Design a protein around this nucleic acid. Sequence first.
RNA 1: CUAUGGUCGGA
RNA 2: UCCGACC
RNA 3: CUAUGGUCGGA
RNA 4: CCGACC
Lengths: 934, 908
Amino acid sequence: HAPVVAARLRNIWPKFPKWLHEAPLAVAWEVTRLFMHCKVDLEDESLLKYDPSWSTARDVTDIWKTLYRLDAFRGKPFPEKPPNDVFVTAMTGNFESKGSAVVLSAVLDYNPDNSPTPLYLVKLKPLMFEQGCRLTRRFGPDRFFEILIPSPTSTSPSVPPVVSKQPGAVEEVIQWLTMGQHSLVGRQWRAFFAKDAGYRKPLREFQPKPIIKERVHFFAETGITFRPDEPVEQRTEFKVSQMLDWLLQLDNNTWQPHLKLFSRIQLGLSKTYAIMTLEPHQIRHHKTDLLSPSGTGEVMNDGVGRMSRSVAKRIRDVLGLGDVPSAVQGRFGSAKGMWVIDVDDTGDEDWIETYPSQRKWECDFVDKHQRTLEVRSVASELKSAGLNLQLLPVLEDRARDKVKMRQAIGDRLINDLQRQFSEQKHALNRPVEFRQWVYESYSRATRVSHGRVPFLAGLPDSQEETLNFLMNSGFDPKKQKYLQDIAWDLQKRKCDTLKSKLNIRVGRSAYIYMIADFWGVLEENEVHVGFSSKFRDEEESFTLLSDCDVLVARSPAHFPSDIQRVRAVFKPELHSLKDVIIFSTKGDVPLAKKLSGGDYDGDMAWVCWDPEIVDGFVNAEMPLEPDLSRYLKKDKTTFKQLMASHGTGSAAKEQTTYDMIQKSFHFALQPNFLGMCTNYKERLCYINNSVSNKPAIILSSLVGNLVDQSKQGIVFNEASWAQLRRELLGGALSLPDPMYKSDSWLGRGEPTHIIDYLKFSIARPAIDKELEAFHNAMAHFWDPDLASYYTFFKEISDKSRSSALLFTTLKNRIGEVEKEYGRLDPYPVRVNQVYEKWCAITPESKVIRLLELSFLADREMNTWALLRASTAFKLYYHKSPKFVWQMAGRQLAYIKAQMTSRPGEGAPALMTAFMYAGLMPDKKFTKQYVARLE
Amino acid sequence: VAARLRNIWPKFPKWLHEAPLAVAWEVTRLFMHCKVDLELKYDPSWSTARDVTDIWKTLYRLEKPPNDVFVTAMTGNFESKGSAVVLSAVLDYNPDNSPAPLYLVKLKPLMFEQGCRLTRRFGPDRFFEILIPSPTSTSPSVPPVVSKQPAVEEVIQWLTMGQHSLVGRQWRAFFAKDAGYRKPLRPIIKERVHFFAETGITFRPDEPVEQRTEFKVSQMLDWLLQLDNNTWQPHLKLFSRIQLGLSKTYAIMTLEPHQIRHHKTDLLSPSGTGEVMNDGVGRMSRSVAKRIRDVLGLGDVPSAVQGRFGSAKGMWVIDVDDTGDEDWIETYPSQRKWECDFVDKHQRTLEVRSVASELKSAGLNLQLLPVLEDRARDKVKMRQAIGDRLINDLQRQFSEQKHALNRPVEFRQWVYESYSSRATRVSHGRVPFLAGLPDSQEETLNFLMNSGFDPKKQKYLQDIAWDLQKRKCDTLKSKLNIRVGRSAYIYMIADFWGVLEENEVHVGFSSKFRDEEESFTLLSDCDVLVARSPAHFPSDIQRVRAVFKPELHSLKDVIIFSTKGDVPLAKKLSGGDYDGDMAWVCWDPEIVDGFVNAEMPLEPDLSRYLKKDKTTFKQLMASHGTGSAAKEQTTYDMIQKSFHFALQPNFLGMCTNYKERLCYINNSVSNKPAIILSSLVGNLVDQSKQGIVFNEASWAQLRRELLGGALSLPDPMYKSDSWLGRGEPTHIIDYLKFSIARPAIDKELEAFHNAEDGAHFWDPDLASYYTFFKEISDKSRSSALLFTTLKNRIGEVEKEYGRPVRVNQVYEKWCAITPESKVIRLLELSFLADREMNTWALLRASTAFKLYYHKSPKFVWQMAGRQLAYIKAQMTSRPGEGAPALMTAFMYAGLMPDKKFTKQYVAR
RNA sequence: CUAUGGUCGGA
RNA sequence: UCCGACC
RNA sequence: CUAUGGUCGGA
RNA sequence: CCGACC
Ligand SMILES: Nc1ncnc2c1ncn2[C@@H]1O[C@H](COP(=O)(O)NP(=O)(O)OP(=O)(O)O)[C@@H](O)[C@H]1O
Ligand SMILES: Nc1ncnc2c1ncn2[C@@H]1O[C@H](COP(=O)(O)NP(=O)(O)OP(=O)(O)O)[C@@H](O)[C@H]1O
Ligand SMILES: [Ca+2]
Ligand SMILES: [Ca+2]
Ligand SMILES: [Ca+2]
Ligand SMILES: [Ca+2]
Ligand SMILES: [Ca+2]
């Protein structure tokens, strides 16, 4: 224990005042947030009484407004607010809505202040909706709390000295989180799980250097409204040791290593849709997994089991899938993995089966929540995959001819790049074609979410949506530079991402869920692939794969055996199973294991049927993996072993359960070297140009062990890595960064590595060229139509000096806004801040009334907004382009659509925001209209 | 009427002798419209003209070709992008009976049509087509000059004995086919007759359109059919084979003799019978198929194609066993309709008319229903199944509509599903608009909902929507279309690889065939029903097992029948083949399970009434002797004799309608009268190829003797909207139309007819501008004078409305309402070319809405629906809750509702 | 330095 | 860029 | 007097 | 309404 660290930790959480005690949790959570955002103290006695209006509020703004009446909060702008729908569910829906759960979340960062009197600064995140899990469905979404705390074991200079200077500081923080309850919004929260959230950006509001953080989950053991011994406001006291007992059934699972049992807490936190509750007589718990016909004892169906057609149909019905899913990824009590339809089920009786490989603990499957099929994902329409940097070295190593494939793969890159550019170049010629291309290039989900095309100031947020909106109003990309600039910026970034990452697209490739052949119709080295609908490559299209060789691989891929070549055979017996890849249950070892120790529990495989990539590949036998026992030490302490220290009985289990949390939290907070070790393997293999050498194979095994550290209880310290680096590896500790990690070639001579040849010799030369050709194929800013209103007002100015003053004030105000735009808290807030000043410009009688048209609620739909936009265009079309568009792009589109319309030639349509989002381009119309001209 | 026939065609005078054919045709057409007799000013501007309008302008002293066609005719040699321009004419009987011309000629404007082998080889300019009223017509409107029939032989002689002169070229008839009953241009059967230009003013004795070489029709036919080696064939069938030359086919490639595989024997039955199992179908290379995709713009290689290669006519399928990159094609005796050397490129060019494409649901034909009941193990079960499906389907259509109307977004999707306007949109480039609203009511509903109007809350929209369903329900009453989702019409191919057994078929889809709840990419382990139209015999529908063979997996959007077995399955299907035949394939269990097969019937020999002219070309030549002159005379005689055979009236339509009427009265399709009628109608369809001669006398003999009932047979009850028969309806069609569909339709109709919280015409949002300018007018007489004038002027227009051309006249007066100072300029924007986009138009629409929503509702929406939509979109927008978009007319017509958006949003 | 790849969802 | 599950 | 069914485009 | 095709 370290005293200085402990003193700062005594009061880091926001306090709950007596006045707020009556408040519902949702209002309490939101009111505390505003007070913190505005610096006001909740317990401050200078001004506080509960407002009955808060008890019955469907908008947070109403609650926050009553507080803003006090001057204390009046100066600061309002903080991010919970969406109204989430707030309503928290107050009246019991924190759950159509499977979704409101989540109380917080992010914690270190206090810059080093004063001995809070170590951590806390921001409570707004109320948000997130898919529910088993535990939220069983004990209440209101009894759970997530925090992102900076990891005590961070080796960053950013860490405060109090933690770094005083050893034992790590233990004090772990004790602080795991020893006792934490008070917040009237509830006592106890910790029960923690997982790595990765290196994260410290909050700017509080502070700039990334620090490793940890997600710690809390459970409300008790609260003010809690009752000793169903509604969120009247929960019954319950100890963390009891929720965990309900989930893991600890009594029958004391034989497991406690660190792995702690790992299984995630299965109760997995975000899943609840489908149905099977009856006990409908569950077939297999006691033996499918085993090798050879006799090797290898399991051939790891994590995959069968399910009835009726169960699959209910999944479709509950999720509105529209087609019955051949396979699903879900959890069923202790069972985790995949479930596939039994092709032999002819009845309508519900049934599911579990396998040992699936059941992660011993479960009795009695509670309804332990017999509920929770679905996390469904096999769905397949999309084309690409190559990645990890598959290239392995592809070169197993190539029969390395030189042939290096050029062959490079061909796919140059051909795809020229084709990518050619389609855009031709489409840019006609706006109907460019719109259709832009829609194909990328926003349905945002449109459904916002019920409108989301807008940042006066233009659509998305650049693809901005281009389509402007073209829909009559703007030509070949005639308006602003539109041209967007397409240029778009392609440049898309090419930049190809330069930065060699995501070489392979059309005859896809990521498909891996399933096992329970029916034994597939022989070893034979796979079955079926597609729900036509899979289209530009040259040809497929509904199934037959009479072809395919390459199956999984990420992460390090070993030469990680990519394997197999023959695709279509078995009419497995025709119903579509959008899945079925490996054989025959053979000594499951094919999935060859793929980076893969399973059929949710794993997806990279399937390539491209011949120019498949036929140059030869298979490798699985490698002899080294024994790294000295470097990697595994804690296999069982729950029973922890229990012996305490004794026998309920109290002993309760103490043991808390001890498992404390011990596991230390193991979790321990530093992970998976990234450093994988990066080292890349550097070493680059220097040696070998992914097959003994150092590579050793490093491939170490990275393979490190990824499974939490489940396998592996303790690895910086010392063991150095010890491993100096003994098994050739006494090299710090290795040079590779040339590819660099934008421009800094190497001596022609590129030597496969990735180097592709990045600097096949991609950058082609990319630099295709851009120039596209630029040459690609136009002013000026538009005599976008300034019709300016001409109208100058003519009016000649008639009246009052008409002249309005223009003078308008022009000067527009210039002030431009100065602000040049000067300007992230980018969106700055844009809105300039936009508010833009919309501020206002007429300030008969002319003013005609200009303001105040009967219209949106002033941005009045004639004055149009004149204000036309004048801005005349003022800044050459001077500052982005200003006129980012601000008045919407009104400019109105003007163009008004000007382009010509008598007797149809009628333009003013579409409501919502109805505009629903419409989509008709490809059929585009081809036929193009045909009539051509 | 020979004297009338002397001057039928428009005359060509010396002043037009030195003229391009395209200009001559167009100028002749214009003189005819203006009735200026051709019989001396020739403008040379025409020869280099690229638009007819410019040529026509020269004729300013006293139905028009598109620009592309005229250009192609003038400088493209009459051929562009495969298309050939066509000189078509329509002939109609002259009203005057003066011994004046018998027919009146209207030369149709030059137009693009798909090319044929004959147009490609000899030039489209050498081909002329006409639609002539048939001489054998029994209609009263036939002029007495021919009605007396002292005449049929003479008119046939006029068409075939000699050449005809129209635009400087001599035209001789080579082929004729039935064009059906066609209304005379301002109903009588017409025959299409095809003419070829043997000689012309620009022709050369012993190539450019204006520099052709003289070629007789006999020679052209000799090139196509190789008559020297085809004398054995009956002349009537050889005349029939001319159609293959005139078939509209896309030219893909010319194959070299070494790449052409000719087979001396077809695939025969392995069980000795010697029946043919591959009639009309052969194999091609994956490379040949790839070029069909490349030249035709297909997004995938076709697995089977329908086309012609020389003598061969039929279907070609990719060899699943072909691993090569070399072009090859196969020919079989069944496909070849004449002996061809395959020496000329035009006779070695693969010509594709159609490709196997994505399949669609077909539904149940009325012909199929009697056969289904006749061959069902339990008839009552079959009746209850199809009937219950119809009841369920009808309820679903209505249920979807009622739920859809509740939410705008949802209703828009249904309206698009109900009717597609893409054909109209692409042609106009915009949504067609009459006055102030879209021309189509369905488009009007979408346009107004897009601006924010709700059908449930707005009366105008509700009334239109109610009318649309009323029309759809009325359409349902008139015709009983039972629709089966698990049904499709698929091209039939044969198994060249021997995988399938006798009762097995293989079907694979190019994509996902979607049924309401289930989806298919292949058919496996299911029983299917295979049938063809026309289906009359009890055996014309057969039940088979669908087995997916991976060996045939690359063949998609085709159903493969077995080569094993005594008789091919196709023959069972109304005497079918694999030459382009499409089978109705149904895998809906409830339809399939009750069916049990029937063997092919023993058909009666009706030779007494059906006689075949099996006279051969050699027999016709024997009359003329031996030699080229004898062949020329025989070829011309065949055209003349064949023209008579073809012009003979066809009784298939009357005979089929009789079988339908008698079989309905008997309620049997398996009885002796039905089998006899079925054989007669089966033979009559193949009359042209088989030389069958049938006359009213032959028909009256069959009716008097075999069929019985030589009396007018009454029409079936199902042919009428309601059930006037006695008792509950007992015929399958009558039960389904009157005892099942009508009540269900009526129940929904009563529900719609049966129906303050409801649709109201009033919208406070639409009177916004009126109230805005009232407040100004109350404090300004100057504006008030303008306001009063507009209100009264609208009143004048409202009086003018009264109640397509008329609506436009009112719209013109409505647009005329315009101002007649700073205010008037703001109201009427000069900068805007379309003043319908100005502020004044919105004010006039608002003032018109308030004044006439109660009294003259239709007047406001027809005149100002456009502006009312703008006003609605403006008023409904709320600050910071999105931005309404002003689409252009063109960009608007190119947008379609995203079905995924409608479903996802409703779930929200 | 520095501390992984991949699938998908979001605002 | 940020946020959240999954292997 | 009345004079067929089906598949595919369309204007 | 006018075109292919079986
Ligand atoms: N964060 C990650 N980064 C890279 N690879 C990962 C990551 N997470 C999972 N994988 C891959 O997926 C595998 C994880 O396997 P599982 O998630 O199936 N867990 P497993 O070890 O099988 O234990 P059970 O829960 O099944 O009893 C790893 O070995 C990696 O190959
Ligand atoms: N106008 C029509 N009305 C009804 N059925 C028709 C019609 N035209 C064609 N069919 C159908 O298609 C069949 C024609 O068969 P084909 O078009 O296959 N010709 P076919 O007699 O076999 O001789 P070939 O040219 O192949 O040597 C008819 O028997 C009908 O089943
Ligand atoms: Ca594993
Ligand atoms: Ca796994
Ligand atoms: Ca696993
Ligand atoms: Ca036939
Ligand atoms: Ca990652």
